[PDB]
Amino acid sequence: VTAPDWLADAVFYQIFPERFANADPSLDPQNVVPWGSTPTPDNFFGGDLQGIIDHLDHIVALGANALYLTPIFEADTNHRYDAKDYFSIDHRLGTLETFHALMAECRARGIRIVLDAVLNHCGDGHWAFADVVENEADSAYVNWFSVEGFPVTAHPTPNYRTCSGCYYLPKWNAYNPEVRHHHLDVARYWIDQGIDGWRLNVPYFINHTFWREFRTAVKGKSEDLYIVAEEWRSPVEWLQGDTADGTMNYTARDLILGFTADGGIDASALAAGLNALHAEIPAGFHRGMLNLLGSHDTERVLTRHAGDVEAALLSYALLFSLEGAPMVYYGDEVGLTGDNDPGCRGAMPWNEESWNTRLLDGIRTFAAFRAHQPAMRRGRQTAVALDADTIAIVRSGGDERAAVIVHRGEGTTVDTASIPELAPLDADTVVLGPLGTASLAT
Template sequence: MHRIRAVTNLLDQPHHDGSALHVPEGTPTLGDRVPVRVRVPQAAGVDRVWLRTVRDGEPRLSEAVRDGDTPGGEASFVTEVDVHNPVTPYRFLLDGSGGYRWLDGRGVHDRDVPDAGSFRLTTHAPAPAWLGDGLVYQVFPDRFARSGAASDRAVPDWAAPAAWDDEPAGDGVLAGTQLYGGDLDGITEHLDHLVALGVGTVYLTPVFPGRSNHRYDASTFDHVDPLLGGDEAYARLSAAVHARGMRLMGDITTNHTGQEHEWFARALADPTSPERGMYVWDEPGRPDVATTPDGAGYAAWLGFGSLPKLDWSSPETWRRLVTGDRAPITRYLREPFGLDGWRVDVANMTGRWGSADRAHDVARELRAAVVGERPDAGLIAEHFHDATHDLLAGGWHANMNYTGFTRPAWSWLAQHGSPVAAHGLPVAGVRRPGSAMVAAMRDFDAAVPWSVTARQWNLLGSHDTPRLATVVGSAELVEVAATLLFTYPGTPVVFAGDEVGATGDNGEHARTTMAWDQGARGGGPRWDAATLDVYRRLSAVRRGSSALRDGGLRWAVVTEDAVVFLRESPTERVLVVLARGPWAGAVLPGHLVAPGASPEPLYGQVEVRATEAGIVVPGDGPGVGVHRLA
């Protein structure tokens, strides 16, 4: 893994990112020449800067021009990138005392580096701006709230009824069949909680009928599950969400349907039917192939026969899901539902089977359909591992950022001897130093254009992971994690319950209900009012800061137990201090604040002071500090 040296002050290094201080805002087109800027501190010992691109397979170098100095003594070098491909990589050659070095998205290197870490400009339009206006709040409908009508609905034959305060099953059949009875009108009744939290987008996991509490095994896309209140309740929820100035995003499976889906039923009943061609058929006994009662083999998600895989080489699949009059991808964007976009389940597997790989074509066509129906709609992928190549293809606007945010944050903040496994791995989690977290974040951020990084769905947990409180083991470290979530580039995503201290050992066990009765009383064992206050205050700080919403990222200090970084926009500079424990502290350059000015505390316990020696960051911890410097 690429490592970053733990130094007192990384602000002595040259810096570039894709934010407005370094690259003009907007999406370029092919043939544009885009000016890009590098900031070079005097202490860096750099005299000349070149831009390196690769055109038609051959590296090209062009020297940057020094066009002024900042009040802090940083030299500014500017040159132009010729946007000759839909994704155009570039990096900088630095020359001066000590010999040449390279600057790319992973940092400054005194060695030769591969192109994988280069900065990138792209002609692909970014995610809609509204995705970054507030936090995204994920709701698992069965576990959020019951309306009065929920108790009148018959329990389906597959379900095991549960009382609202029952502990969720963490494994076995019950994990998928335990039914608590939350519904869509229940969500509508509690939207004021979301408004107070600063939610900008409400994201619901699937609402289509299935034979599980998670509903990723849809039996139809034609209507909303009556157990949730049906189409009418979905329309009521949408109207209520939009009336409060929020957005609503759905969740759909493009990789598979449920085994009980009407399409698959017809495919089994009639081998000559058009539905037969909508699924992937293969030889029994091969990996991830399930078997029908008559002995035919069909591809299934990870081999689970209940989730047969769709074949995107079939025109009928396109018609039923995307292009037809009742195709769900576009129909639910229209009234009376009015969804603002989709999160796509296991997007990384959609269109892929063996040597057939249509994933990028599918993603691009899904975007074209969604944006064609609603120009401001969003399309977010679920991709648990390295989504780099998928995010460069012009399909998904962004990804659920497990690899570039969740896993690195967990690895730094996990309690020693954490009871939960490393996410997605059959091994125990491990507590790593701050340098490992930052190196992982920079690796994944550098691999995609800044326009993607700026809208990635960053999360500290979801319905597929253990709960944050269980991973880190203390309220103090929950606060450190939440502060990282609300101050890091991208869109913060909160799984319902994290804001009140929910616990859970794995994805299924983490699907807890909301203890609304305890909330009404001001708190309780399942409703931590102090944690809720942390989330509300941090959300408000982010909403009120242009630097935290849209600014660049510049690492200042990286040590084992603390990290410090700057977020900078053209009008604001914010300093973020995160410490998982006591550390040595640091002194940053005094020019970061105006002469005679003092850092303005926005949040946290760590007090940063401007002195004659510079900006003093104390070694308090665990703790956080968010300060406006300019």
């Protein structure tokens, strides 16, 4: 197949729901921490679904029209990849009624919602696993997991298969038809609650036979439901038409940040990598790629840039220029900082005096350009290096075209007429100042 058409016009906002906004005190756990606390793997801040509803104006003001939520099902941890019941929202987030309110408000605003499908593993608190821990070989669920022997032992190393050796993340046995039934049931159930797509967590830990069945199940509900795979290496395996519509585009993240933050990759090397990536992606799937600069699994963009806001803006300029759907990680738009998980999972500040408004306004501008220019959404991409510190991202439909020139040096001029991919813009000589960008259209 090809990715859903609507992805061309999508702009995602990624939220880690424990940390976006706390609107309902009745849902706070007894162990809640102050909103300004340092995140850790164990604490709870009380972010909730009503908090999301209440701040949808912020997200629409940024230019986003879709949300990617990390897991929201009942779970013991703050990140919720350890689900204990795939059929219930976590009690600290809210009820199913509140979830439907969020969906209804999103539908009213034209915002789509993509949830995080965690099918490789559950939590050790999941009712099926607890039943195996208690009843052992007599449990009906023993073969829902891969338990080496009894008793079940977590420490010092688990005697059961897990996600990357983590004792509290037992691995689901996806070779058991009963487990596959459960998983495909979860996929269909949440679609029925109104969601618009699923992001696949570590799909490479399962197998393609299962993911083909998953696509069939999802697309059987609606061909317009989006499936995006988490993939940190090449996307190609997920874009053959039988599994995903796109991947999280971590390849492009690495290219962009190597140029704008690290210094190590120059414009020639950035263009060659972008063009090679675009060529590897099959036609019909470029639009489904979910492009990003950071996530809940990376340091924050502004930290990667060592606090250099103008340089960080270069990375946003590149992000919004690329074919595929751009995604901003919550808080990055106001210049939050932090090292990798747990450091990137700080609470979103709502006191606007802490906000970096140069970043916010800048990202808003790049979003507006893409929104206004059809070619920036539906146009094919070519990357053209001009010199070691200067790159142009050209998006061309037919007769029309647009281009974003990004410069990481101390200034340059571009003779647009001498560059064949830029010549149709009829833009003459463009002068860029230090860490400058320019956005041009026919």
